[PDB]
Amino acid sequence: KTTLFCASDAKAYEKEVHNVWATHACVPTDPNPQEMVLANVTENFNMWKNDMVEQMHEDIISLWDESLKPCVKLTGGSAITQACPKVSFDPIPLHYCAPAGFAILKCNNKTFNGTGPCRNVSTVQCTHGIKPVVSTQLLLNGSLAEEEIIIRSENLTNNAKTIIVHLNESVNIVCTRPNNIRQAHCNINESKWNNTLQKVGEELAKHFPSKTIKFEPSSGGDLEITTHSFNCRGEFFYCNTSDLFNGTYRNGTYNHTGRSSNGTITLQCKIKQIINMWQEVGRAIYAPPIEGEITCNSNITGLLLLRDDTETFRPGGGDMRDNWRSELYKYKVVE
Numbered sequence: 452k453t454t455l456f457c458a459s460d461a462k463a464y465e466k467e468v469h470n471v472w473a474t475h476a477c478v479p480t481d482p483n484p485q486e487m488v489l490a491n492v493t494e495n496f497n498m499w500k501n502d503m504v505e506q507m508h509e510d511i512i513s514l515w516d517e518s519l520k521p522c523v524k525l526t527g528g529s530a531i532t533q534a535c536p537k538v539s540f541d542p543i544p545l546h547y548c549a550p551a552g553f554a555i556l557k558c559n560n561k562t563f564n565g566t567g568p569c570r571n572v573s574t575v576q577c578t579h580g581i582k583p584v585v586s587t588q589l590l591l592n593g594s595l596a597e598e599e600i601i602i603r604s605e606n607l608t609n610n611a612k613t614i615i616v617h618l619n620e621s622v623n624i625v626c627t628r629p630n631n632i633r634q635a636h637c638n639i640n641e642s643k644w645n646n647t648l649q650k651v652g653e654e655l656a657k658h659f660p661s662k663t664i665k666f667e668p669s670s671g672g673d674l675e676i677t678t679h680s681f682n683c684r685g686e687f688f689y690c691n692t693s694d695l696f697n698g699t700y701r702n703g704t705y706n707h708t709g710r711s712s713n714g715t716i717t718l719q720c721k722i723k724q725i726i727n728m729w730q731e732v733g734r735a736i737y738a739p740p741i742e743g744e745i746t747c748n749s750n751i752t753g754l755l756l757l758r759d760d761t762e763t764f765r766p767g768g769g770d771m772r773d774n775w776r777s778e779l780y781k782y783k784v785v786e
Protein backbone atom coordinates (compact mmCIF):
# COMPACT_ATOMS: atom_id res chain seq x y z
CA LYS A 452 0.00 0.00 0.00
CA THR A 453 3.19 2.12 0.45
CA THR A 454 6.96 1.75 -0.06
CA LEU A 455 8.77 -0.30 2.61
CA PHE A 456 12.40 -0.09 3.66
CA CYS A 457 14.80 -2.89 4.56
CA ALA A 458 16.80 -3.50 7.69
CA SER A 459 19.77 -5.82 7.77
CA ASP A 460 22.65 -6.66 10.05
CA ALA A 461 25.27 -6.17 7.30
CA LYS A 462 28.78 -4.82 7.72
CA ALA A 463 30.26 -2.07 5.63
CA TYR A 464 33.58 -4.00 6.06
CA GLU A 465 32.44 -7.28 4.60
CA LYS A 466 33.32 -7.36 0.90
CA GLU A 467 30.59 -9.97 0.53
CA VAL A 468 28.26 -8.30 -1.94
CA HIS A 469 24.96 -8.75 -0.10
CA ASN A 470 26.63 -6.92 2.79
CA VAL A 471 27.85 -4.10 0.52
CA TRP A 472 24.45 -3.65 -1.06
CA ALA A 473 22.61 -3.76 2.28
CA THR A 474 25.01 -1.21 3.77
CA HIS A 475 24.03 1.17 0.97
CA ALA A 476 20.32 0.30 0.90
CA CYS A 477 19.16 -0.81 4.37
CA VAL A 478 19.09 0.65 7.89
CA PRO A 479 20.34 -1.26 10.95
CA THR A 480 17.95 -3.71 12.54
CA ASP A 481 16.25 -2.58 15.72
CA PRO A 482 17.79 -4.82 18.40
CA ASN A 483 14.43 -5.64 20.04
CA PRO A 484 11.41 -5.38 17.74
CA GLN A 485 7.96 -4.56 19.04
CA GLU A 486 5.13 -7.07 18.58
CA MET A 487 1.42 -6.58 19.37
CA VAL A 488 -0.81 -9.68 19.39
CA LEU A 489 -4.59 -9.55 18.68
CA ALA A 490 -6.25 -13.04 18.74
CA ASN A 491 -9.78 -11.56 18.41
CA VAL A 492 -9.15 -9.61 15.23
CA THR A 493 -9.25 -12.07 12.29
CA GLU A 494 -8.11 -10.66 8.96
CA ASN A 495 -7.68 -11.76 5.37
CA PHE A 496 -4.37 -12.38 3.61
CA ASN A 497 -3.49 -13.27 0.05
CA MET A 498 0.13 -14.27 -0.41
CA TRP A 499 -0.47 -14.39 -4.17
CA LYS A 500 -1.47 -10.72 -4.45
CA ASN A 501 1.00 -9.17 -2.03
CA ASP A 502 2.83 -5.99 -2.81
CA MET A 503 5.67 -6.78 -0.44
CA VAL A 504 6.65 -9.46 -2.99
CA GLU A 505 7.00 -6.84 -5.74
CA GLN A 506 9.00 -4.46 -3.56
CA MET A 507 11.37 -7.27 -2.51
CA HIS A 508 11.68 -8.57 -6.09
CA GLU A 509 12.79 -5.09 -7.18
CA ASP A 510 15.32 -5.00 -4.37
CA ILE A 511 16.89 -8.33 -5.27
CA ILE A 512 17.05 -7.38 -8.96
CA SER A 513 18.90 -4.25 -7.89
CA LEU A 514 21.19 -6.29 -5.60
CA TRP A 515 22.12 -8.77 -8.34
CA ASP A 516 22.68 -5.91 -10.80
CA GLU A 517 25.10 -4.19 -8.48
CA SER A 518 26.73 -7.45 -7.32
CA LEU A 519 26.73 -10.15 -10.07
CA LYS A 520 27.57 -8.17 -13.14
CA PRO A 521 27.83 -10.41 -16.21
CA CYS A 522 30.59 -10.00 -18.72
CA VAL A 523 27.90 -9.75 -21.40
CA LYS A 524 24.19 -9.11 -21.01
CA LEU A 525 22.01 -9.92 -24.03
CA THR A 526 18.50 -8.45 -23.82
CA GLY A 527 16.62 -8.30 -27.08
CA GLY A 528 18.88 -6.85 -29.73
CA SER A 529 21.40 -5.05 -27.57
CA ALA A 530 24.42 -6.57 -25.82
CA ILE A 531 26.05 -4.87 -22.81
CA THR A 532 29.59 -5.65 -21.73
CA GLN A 533 31.30 -4.85 -18.47
CA ALA A 534 33.83 -5.92 -15.90
CA CYS A 535 32.71 -9.23 -14.36
CA PRO A 536 35.11 -9.81 -11.42
CA LYS A 537 34.69 -12.87 -9.24
CA VAL A 538 33.14 -11.79 -5.94
CA SER A 539 32.40 -13.17 -2.52
CA PHE A 540 28.71 -14.01 -2.53
CA ASP A 541 26.68 -15.43 0.35
CA PRO A 542 23.08 -14.27 0.98
CA ILE A 543 22.39 -12.47 4.26
CA PRO A 544 18.93 -11.98 5.82
CA LEU A 545 16.86 -8.87 5.01
CA HIS A 546 13.99 -7.46 7.05
CA TYR A 547 11.16 -5.55 5.39
CA CYS A 548 9.83 -2.67 7.45
CA ALA A 549 6.69 -0.52 7.38
CA PRO A 550 7.40 3.24 7.43
CA ALA A 551 5.85 5.73 9.89
CA GLY A 552 2.05 5.48 9.99
CA PHE A 553 1.98 1.98 8.56
CA ALA A 554 2.27 -1.43 10.13
CA ILE A 555 2.95 -4.97 9.06
CA LEU A 556 0.35 -7.54 10.03
CA LYS A 557 1.68 -11.02 10.69
CA CYS A 558 -0.64 -14.00 10.71
CA ASN A 559 0.33 -16.38 13.52
CA ASN A 560 -1.86 -19.40 12.67
CA LYS A 561 0.85 -22.08 12.31
CA THR A 562 -1.13 -23.86 9.53
CA PHE A 563 -2.25 -20.83 7.52
CA ASN A 564 -2.04 -21.73 3.85
CA GLY A 565 -1.38 -18.14 2.66
CA THR A 566 -4.93 -17.29 1.66
CA GLY A 567 -8.21 -16.34 3.30
CA PRO A 568 -8.99 -15.37 6.89
CA CYS A 569 -6.59 -15.80 9.80
CA ARG A 570 -7.74 -15.51 13.41
CA ASN A 571 -4.61 -14.91 15.53
CA VAL A 572 -2.91 -11.78 14.20
CA SER A 573 -0.04 -9.52 15.34
CA THR A 574 1.27 -6.12 14.28
CA VAL A 575 5.02 -5.68 13.79
CA GLN A 576 7.58 -3.12 12.68
CA CYS A 577 9.35 -5.53 10.27
CA THR A 578 9.23 -9.04 8.86
CA HIS A 579 11.63 -11.68 10.05
CA GLY A 580 14.97 -11.84 8.29
CA ILE A 581 14.64 -13.38 4.82
CA LYS A 582 17.67 -14.61 2.90
CA PRO A 583 17.03 -13.74 -0.78
CA VAL A 584 18.02 -17.10 -2.24
CA VAL A 585 17.61 -17.41 -6.02
CA SER A 586 16.88 -20.99 -7.13
CA THR A 587 14.48 -23.29 -8.98
CA GLN A 588 12.76 -26.57 -7.95
CA LEU A 589 14.03 -26.47 -4.36
CA LEU A 590 13.65 -23.56 -1.96
CA LEU A 591 16.88 -23.33 0.06
CA ASN A 592 17.71 -21.81 3.44
CA GLY A 593 14.19 -20.53 4.14
CA SER A 594 12.29 -20.98 7.37
CA LEU A 595 10.43 -24.19 8.12
CA ALA A 596 6.71 -24.59 8.80
CA GLU A 597 6.06 -24.96 12.48
CA GLU A 598 3.35 -27.60 12.67
CA GLU A 599 2.76 -29.66 9.46
CA ILE A 600 3.78 -29.39 5.88
CA ILE A 601 1.68 -26.69 4.21
CA ILE A 602 0.55 -26.79 0.57
CA ARG A 603 0.23 -23.28 -0.86
CA SER A 604 -1.27 -22.40 -4.20
CA GLU A 605 -3.25 -19.55 -5.66
CA ASN A 606 -5.58 -22.22 -7.07
CA LEU A 607 -4.93 -25.95 -6.68
CA THR A 608 -7.54 -26.84 -9.34
CA ASN A 609 -5.71 -24.75 -11.95
CA ASN A 610 -2.69 -26.92 -12.77
CA ALA A 611 -0.86 -23.95 -14.33
CA LYS A 612 -0.45 -22.32 -10.88
CA THR A 613 2.77 -23.08 -9.05
CA ILE A 614 2.44 -25.15 -5.86
CA ILE A 615 4.69 -24.13 -2.97
CA VAL A 616 5.33 -26.96 -0.50
CA HIS A 617 6.44 -25.61 2.89
CA LEU A 618 8.43 -28.31 4.70
CA ASN A 619 8.48 -28.67 8.50
CA GLU A 620 11.83 -30.48 8.56
CA SER A 621 14.74 -29.44 6.39
CA VAL A 622 16.64 -31.84 4.13
CA ASN A 623 20.36 -31.23 3.80
CA ILE A 624 21.76 -30.80 0.29
CA VAL A 625 25.53 -30.55 -0.18
CA CYS A 626 26.86 -29.45 -3.59
CA THR A 627 30.54 -29.19 -4.47
CA ARG A 628 32.79 -28.67 -7.43
CA PRO A 629 35.85 -30.48 -6.03
CA ASN A 630 39.43 -29.26 -6.42
CA ASN A 631 36.31 -31.08 -16.09
CA ILE A 632 36.32 -27.82 -14.15
CA ARG A 633 32.57 -27.36 -14.75
CA GLN A 634 31.52 -30.61 -13.20
CA ALA A 635 30.02 -30.91 -9.72
CA HIS A 636 27.58 -33.04 -7.74
CA CYS A 637 25.12 -32.80 -4.86
CA ASN A 638 24.46 -35.35 -2.13
CA ILE A 639 21.14 -35.90 -0.39
CA ASN A 640 20.51 -38.55 2.30
CA GLU A 641 18.03 -40.93 0.59
CA SER A 642 16.40 -41.75 3.91
CA LYS A 643 15.65 -38.12 4.80
CA TRP A 644 14.36 -37.36 1.30
CA ASN A 645 12.32 -40.58 1.29
CA ASN A 646 10.68 -39.57 4.52
CA THR A 647 9.83 -36.02 3.42
CA LEU A 648 8.32 -37.16 0.11
CA GLN A 649 6.29 -39.68 2.13
CA LYS A 650 4.74 -36.77 4.01
CA VAL A 651 4.44 -34.41 1.06
CA GLY A 652 2.51 -37.17 -0.69
CA GLU A 653 0.30 -37.47 2.40
CA GLU A 654 -0.60 -33.73 2.27
CA LEU A 655 -1.06 -33.73 -1.50
CA ALA A 656 -3.36 -36.74 -1.03
CA LYS A 657 -5.56 -34.76 1.33
CA HIS A 658 -6.02 -32.31 -1.53
CA PHE A 659 -6.40 -34.87 -4.38
CA PRO A 660 -8.01 -37.84 -2.61
CA SER A 661 -8.97 -40.43 -5.24
CA LYS A 662 -5.63 -40.17 -6.94
CA THR A 663 -2.24 -41.90 -6.94
CA ILE A 664 0.46 -39.24 -6.29
CA LYS A 665 3.49 -39.43 -8.62
CA PHE A 666 6.68 -37.35 -8.54
CA GLU A 667 8.50 -37.06 -11.86
CA PRO A 668 11.33 -34.95 -13.29
CA SER A 669 10.64 -31.66 -14.99
CA SER A 670 9.42 -32.30 -18.53
CA GLY A 671 10.98 -29.53 -20.60
CA GLY A 672 12.04 -25.93 -20.74
CA ASP A 673 15.20 -23.99 -20.29
CA LEU A 674 17.89 -25.70 -18.29
CA GLU A 675 17.37 -23.22 -15.42
CA ILE A 676 14.01 -24.88 -14.66
CA THR A 677 14.49 -28.46 -15.84
CA THR A 678 17.32 -28.69 -13.34
CA HIS A 679 17.77 -27.44 -9.80
CA SER A 680 19.70 -24.26 -10.55
CA PHE A 681 21.16 -21.95 -7.92
CA ASN A 682 24.15 -19.69 -7.24
CA CYS A 683 26.87 -21.00 -4.94
CA ARG A 684 29.67 -18.60 -4.02
CA GLY A 685 29.08 -16.68 -7.27
CA GLU A 686 29.04 -19.71 -9.60
CA PHE A 687 25.85 -20.92 -11.31
CA PHE A 688 25.10 -24.59 -10.61
CA TYR A 689 22.68 -26.69 -12.66
CA CYS A 690 21.93 -29.97 -10.85
CA ASN A 691 20.00 -32.83 -12.46
CA THR A 692 17.08 -33.88 -10.26
CA SER A 693 15.73 -36.85 -12.19
CA ASP A 694 16.85 -39.17 -9.37
CA LEU A 695 15.17 -36.84 -6.89
CA PHE A 696 11.67 -36.21 -8.29
CA ASN A 697 11.08 -39.86 -9.10
CA GLY A 698 8.72 -41.79 -6.85
CA THR A 699 5.17 -42.99 -6.22
CA TYR A 700 2.88 -42.53 -3.21
CA ARG A 701 0.27 -45.28 -3.65
CA ASN A 702 -1.70 -46.59 -0.65
CA GLY A 703 -0.59 -44.35 2.15
CA THR A 704 2.99 -45.44 1.26
CA TYR A 705 5.77 -43.68 -0.70
CA ASN A 706 8.18 -45.67 -2.92
CA HIS A 707 11.32 -43.98 -4.27
CA THR A 708 11.94 -44.82 -7.96
CA GLY A 709 15.16 -42.80 -8.41
CA ARG A 710 18.62 -44.28 -8.19
CA SER A 711 20.76 -44.07 -5.06
CA SER A 712 23.91 -45.75 -3.73
CA ASN A 713 25.06 -46.19 -0.13
CA GLY A 714 21.75 -44.51 0.73
CA THR A 715 22.56 -41.13 -0.83
CA ILE A 716 21.03 -39.63 -3.96
CA THR A 717 23.78 -37.97 -5.97
CA LEU A 718 22.81 -35.18 -8.38
CA GLN A 719 25.12 -34.55 -11.34
CA CYS A 720 25.76 -30.81 -11.79
CA LYS A 721 27.34 -28.46 -14.31
CA ILE A 722 28.65 -24.94 -13.65
CA LYS A 723 27.53 -22.85 -16.60
CA GLN A 724 28.61 -19.49 -17.96
CA ILE A 725 25.60 -18.68 -20.19
CA ILE A 726 22.58 -18.00 -17.97
CA ASN A 727 18.94 -17.38 -18.81
CA MET A 728 18.12 -14.48 -16.53
CA TRP A 729 15.46 -14.64 -13.85
CA GLN A 730 15.24 -10.83 -13.74
CA GLU A 731 13.98 -10.31 -17.32
CA VAL A 732 13.95 -12.10 -20.66
CA GLY A 733 17.59 -12.16 -21.67
CA ARG A 734 20.87 -14.03 -21.34
CA ALA A 735 23.91 -13.29 -19.16
CA ILE A 736 27.49 -14.50 -19.67
CA TYR A 737 29.94 -14.89 -16.76
CA ALA A 738 33.62 -15.80 -16.51
CA PRO A 739 34.77 -19.44 -16.04
CA PRO A 740 34.73 -20.91 -12.54
CA ILE A 741 36.91 -19.64 -9.71
CA GLU A 742 39.47 -22.24 -8.85
CA GLY A 743 39.64 -24.83 -6.04
CA GLU A 744 36.72 -26.42 -4.21
CA ILE A 745 33.33 -24.73 -4.45
CA THR A 746 30.91 -26.05 -1.86
CA CYS A 747 27.49 -25.02 -0.54
CA ASN A 748 25.88 -26.81 2.39
CA SER A 749 22.22 -25.82 2.24
CA ASN A 750 18.90 -26.75 3.83
CA ILE A 751 16.03 -27.66 1.51
CA THR A 752 13.06 -26.01 3.23
CA GLY A 753 10.40 -26.09 0.48
CA LEU A 754 9.58 -27.30 -3.01
CA LEU A 755 8.14 -25.63 -6.12
CA LEU A 756 5.84 -28.06 -7.96
CA LEU A 757 3.64 -28.13 -11.04
CA ARG A 758 0.77 -30.59 -11.50
CA ASP A 759 0.04 -32.13 -14.86
CA ASP A 760 -6.72 -41.90 -11.70
CA THR A 761 -3.25 -40.34 -11.13
CA GLU A 762 -1.94 -36.88 -10.27
CA THR A 763 1.64 -36.21 -11.34
CA PHE A 764 3.85 -33.52 -9.83
CA ARG A 765 7.01 -32.18 -11.45
CA PRO A 766 9.48 -29.63 -10.03
CA GLY A 767 8.91 -26.06 -11.18
CA GLY A 768 10.21 -22.54 -10.65
CA GLY A 769 11.56 -19.73 -12.79
CA ASP A 770 9.55 -16.84 -11.35
CA MET A 771 11.63 -15.72 -8.36
CA ARG A 772 8.63 -13.90 -6.90
CA ASP A 773 7.41 -17.33 -5.76
CA ASN A 774 10.63 -17.71 -3.77
CA TRP A 775 9.89 -14.42 -2.02
CA ARG A 776 6.18 -15.35 -1.57
CA SER A 777 7.16 -18.52 0.26
CA GLU A 778 8.59 -16.28 2.98
CA LEU A 779 6.27 -13.24 2.84
CA TYR A 780 3.02 -15.23 2.83
CA LYS A 781 2.12 -14.42 6.45
CA TYR A 782 2.57 -10.67 6.10
CA LYS A 783 0.37 -7.81 4.91
CA VAL A 784 1.05 -4.05 5.16
CA VAL A 785 -1.81 -1.87 6.36
CA GLU A 786 -3.17 1.58 7.35
Ligand SMILES: CNCc1ccc2c(c1)N(C(=O)OCC(F)(F)F)[C@H](CNC(=N)N)[C@H]2NC(=O)C(=O)Nc1ccc(Cl)c(F)c1
Nearest residue numbers: 586587675680681682727728729730731732733768769770
Ligand atom coordinates in the same frame (compact mmCIF):
# COMPACT_ATOMS: atom_id res chain seq x y z
C1 LIG B 1 7.11 -19.96 -13.28
N1 LIG B 1 6.50 -19.52 -14.57
C2 LIG B 1 7.13 -20.18 -15.70
C3 LIG B 1 8.53 -19.53 -15.94
C4 LIG B 1 9.58 -20.40 -16.34
C5 LIG B 1 10.87 -19.91 -16.59
C6 LIG B 1 11.08 -18.55 -16.42
C7 LIG B 1 10.06 -17.69 -16.02
C8 LIG B 1 8.76 -18.15 -15.76
N2 LIG B 1 10.66 -16.39 -15.95
C9 LIG B 1 10.07 -15.26 -15.23
O1 LIG B 1 8.95 -15.22 -14.79
O2 LIG B 1 10.89 -14.17 -15.08
C10 LIG B 1 10.19 -13.13 -14.42
C11 LIG B 1 10.01 -12.02 -15.51
F1 LIG B 1 9.17 -12.52 -16.43
F2 LIG B 1 9.48 -10.90 -14.89
F3 LIG B 1 11.17 -11.68 -16.14
C12 LIG B 1 11.97 -16.28 -16.42
C13 LIG B 1 12.03 -15.37 -17.71
N3 LIG B 1 13.42 -15.12 -18.07
C14 LIG B 1 14.02 -15.64 -19.32
N4 LIG B 1 13.35 -16.32 -20.20
N5 LIG B 1 15.44 -15.37 -19.56
C15 LIG B 1 12.39 -17.73 -16.63
N6 LIG B 1 13.14 -18.03 -15.48
C16 LIG B 1 14.57 -18.09 -15.57
O3 LIG B 1 15.14 -17.91 -16.56
C17 LIG B 1 15.35 -18.42 -14.35
O4 LIG B 1 14.82 -18.68 -13.32
N7 LIG B 1 16.81 -18.42 -14.58
C18 LIG B 1 17.75 -18.64 -13.49
C19 LIG B 1 19.00 -17.99 -13.61
C20 LIG B 1 19.95 -18.10 -12.58
C21 LIG B 1 19.59 -18.83 -11.47
CL1 LIG B 1 20.67 -19.08 -10.06
C22 LIG B 1 18.33 -19.38 -11.35
F4 LIG B 1 18.07 -20.02 -10.24
C23 LIG B 1 17.36 -19.29 -12.34
Ligand SMILES: *[C@@H]1O[C@H](CO)[C@@H](O)[C@H](O)[C@H]1NC(C)=O
Nearest residue numbers: 564566567568602603604607
Ligand atom coordinates in the same frame (compact mmCIF):
# COMPACT_ATOMS: atom_id res chain seq x y z
C1 LIG C 1 -6.46 -22.12 1.63
O1 LIG C 1 -7.49 -21.88 2.61
C2 LIG C 1 -8.67 -21.28 2.05
C3 LIG C 1 -9.61 -21.02 3.21
O2 LIG C 1 -8.97 -20.18 4.16
C4 LIG C 1 -9.28 -22.17 0.97
O3 LIG C 1 -10.38 -21.49 0.37
C5 LIG C 1 -8.24 -22.46 -0.10
O4 LIG C 1 -8.81 -23.36 -1.04
C6 LIG C 1 -7.00 -23.06 0.54
N1 LIG C 1 -5.96 -23.28 -0.46
C7 LIG C 1 -5.13 -24.32 -0.42
C8 LIG C 1 -4.08 -24.38 -1.49
O5 LIG C 1 -5.23 -25.19 0.45
Ligand SMILES: *[C@@H]1O[C@H](CO)[C@@H](O)[C@H](O)[C@H]1NC(C)=O
Nearest residue numbers: 598599600619620650653654
Ligand atom coordinates in the same frame (compact mmCIF):
# COMPACT_ATOMS: atom_id res chain seq x y z
C1 LIG D 1 5.47 -32.58 9.46
O1 LIG D 1 4.16 -32.63 8.73
C2 LIG D 1 3.81 -33.97 8.40
C3 LIG D 1 2.70 -33.96 7.36
O2 LIG D 1 1.96 -32.76 7.33
C4 LIG D 1 3.46 -34.69 9.69
O3 LIG D 1 2.98 -36.00 9.41
C5 LIG D 1 4.73 -34.78 10.53
O4 LIG D 1 4.40 -35.33 11.80
C6 LIG D 1 5.38 -33.42 10.77
N1 LIG D 1 6.71 -33.62 11.32
C7 LIG D 1 7.27 -32.85 12.26
C8 LIG D 1 8.66 -33.24 12.68
O5 LIG D 1 6.70 -31.88 12.75
Ligand SMILES: *[C@@H]1O[C@H](CO)[C@@H](O)[C@H](O)[C@H]1NC(C)=O
Nearest residue numbers: 605606607608609610611612
Ligand atom coordinates in the same frame (compact mmCIF):
# COMPACT_ATOMS: atom_id res chain seq x y z
C1 LIG E 1 -9.45 -22.24 -9.73
O1 LIG E 1 -9.60 -23.37 -10.67
C2 LIG E 1 -10.40 -23.31 -11.86
C3 LIG E 1 -9.46 -23.06 -13.01
O2 LIG E 1 -9.35 -24.23 -13.81
C4 LIG E 1 -11.60 -22.35 -11.80
O3 LIG E 1 -12.77 -23.08 -11.46
C5 LIG E 1 -11.43 -21.15 -10.88
O4 LIG E 1 -10.65 -20.13 -11.49
C6 LIG E 1 -10.78 -21.51 -9.55
N1 LIG E 1 -11.67 -22.32 -8.73
C7 LIG E 1 -11.72 -22.15 -7.40
C8 LIG E 1 -12.60 -23.10 -6.66
O5 LIG E 1 -11.10 -21.25 -6.83
Ligand SMILES: *[C@@H]1O[C@H](CO)[C@@H](O)[C@H](O)[C@H]1NC(C)=O
Nearest residue numbers: 674677678691692693694719
Ligand atom coordinates in the same frame (compact mmCIF):
# COMPACT_ATOMS: atom_id res chain seq x y z
C1 LIG F 1 19.17 -35.63 -16.27
O1 LIG F 1 19.81 -36.95 -16.36
C2 LIG F 1 19.05 -37.91 -17.11
C3 LIG F 1 19.77 -39.23 -17.02
O2 LIG F 1 21.15 -39.01 -16.75
C4 LIG F 1 18.90 -37.42 -18.55
O3 LIG F 1 18.13 -38.37 -19.27
C5 LIG F 1 18.20 -36.07 -18.55
O4 LIG F 1 18.07 -35.58 -19.88
C6 LIG F 1 18.96 -35.07 -17.68
N1 LIG F 1 18.24 -33.81 -17.63
C7 LIG F 1 18.79 -32.64 -17.94
C8 LIG F 1 17.88 -31.43 -17.85
O5 LIG F 1 19.99 -32.54 -18.24
Ligand SMILES: *[C@@H]1O[C@H](CO)[C@@H](O)[C@H](O)[C@H]1NC(C)=O
Nearest residue numbers: 667668693694697708709710
Ligand atom coordinates in the same frame (compact mmCIF):
# COMPACT_ATOMS: atom_id res chain seq x y z
C1 LIG G 1 13.92 -42.57 -12.22
O1 LIG G 1 15.33 -42.97 -12.16
C2 LIG G 1 15.70 -44.02 -13.07
C3 LIG G 1 17.17 -44.30 -12.87
O2 LIG G 1 17.65 -43.73 -11.66
C4 LIG G 1 15.40 -43.60 -14.49
O3 LIG G 1 15.65 -44.74 -15.30
C5 LIG G 1 13.95 -43.19 -14.63
O4 LIG G 1 13.72 -42.72 -15.95
C6 LIG G 1 13.57 -42.11 -13.63
N1 LIG G 1 12.15 -41.82 -13.72
C7 LIG G 1 11.60 -40.94 -14.57
C8 LIG G 1 10.10 -40.83 -14.53
O5 LIG G 1 12.28 -40.24 -15.32
Ligand SMILES: *[C@@H]1O[C@H](CO)[C@@H](O)[C@H](O)[C@H]1NC(C)=O
Nearest residue numbers: 591592681682747748749750
Ligand atom coordinates in the same frame (compact mmCIF):
# COMPACT_ATOMS: atom_id res chain seq x y z
C1 LIG H 1 22.64 -21.78 2.74
O1 LIG H 1 23.21 -21.33 4.03
C2 LIG H 1 24.52 -21.84 4.34
C3 LIG H 1 24.90 -21.28 5.69
O2 LIG H 1 24.76 -19.86 5.69
C4 LIG H 1 25.49 -21.43 3.24
O3 LIG H 1 26.79 -21.95 3.50
C5 LIG H 1 24.99 -21.99 1.92
O4 LIG H 1 25.89 -21.66 0.87
C6 LIG H 1 23.61 -21.44 1.61
N1 LIG H 1 23.16 -21.93 0.32
C7 LIG H 1 22.86 -21.10 -0.68
C8 LIG H 1 22.49 -21.74 -1.98
O5 LIG H 1 22.87 -19.87 -0.54
